[PDB]
Amino acid sequence: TLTGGASGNGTMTVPGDLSSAKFFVGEIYNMTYEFSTPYLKETPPGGGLAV
Amino acid sequence: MPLISSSIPNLINGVSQQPAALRLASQAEEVINCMPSPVEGLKKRPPMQHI
């Protein structure tokens, strides 16, 4: 329920009895990492790198 | 007879007037309306707008 608790706060409902447990509470966020195009690199005659 | 190959690493070195036997092979011969940049290589020049 978005609001409706005491002083307009939000409420949530979970199964079981949690009147004495220890727990956190909060949202969840994602983590995304996209690898690049794999290539080959070698050393040209002039020095340095090339792909 | 070895059938063998090399590569041209970069195209961002512009135009030269030296004889072909003394240049860096990277250097070009005639460049017109190009914008050589190190962030994206060789590209067509930006357009010109009207005010």
A42 to chain B, closest Cα gap in Å: 11
Give CA A49 to chain center in angstroms. Answer: 36
Contact status, residue A5 vs residue A11, Cβ threshold 8 Å: yes
Name which of B4, B5, B7, B23 to mutate to probe chain A: the one with the most chain A Cβ atoms within 10 A of its Cβ.
B7
Residue of B4, B1, B32, B3 lying closest to B14 (CA atoms): B32
Give ∠ CA B23-B31-B19 in degrees, rounded to 5: 25
Give CA A4 to chain center in angstroms. Answer: 29
Method: cryo-EM
Final resolution, Å: 3.8
- CA distances in angstroms from A30 to A27, A33, listed in the order given: 10, 10
Contact status, residue B21 vs residue B11, Cβ threshold 8 Å: no
Helix (H, G, I), strand (E, B) or coil at A25: coil
How many angstroms separate the first and last alpha carbons of chain B? 61
**A8 backbone dihedrals φ, ψ, rounded to 5°:** 75, 10
B9 to chain A, closest Cα gap in Å: 6
d(CA A46, CA B6): 13
SS3 content of chain B, % helix, strand, coil (to 5): 0, 10, 90
A46: which chain B residues are within 8 Å (Cβ-Cβ)? 24
- CA distances in angstroms from B46 to B13, B35, B40, listed in the order given: 19, 8, 13
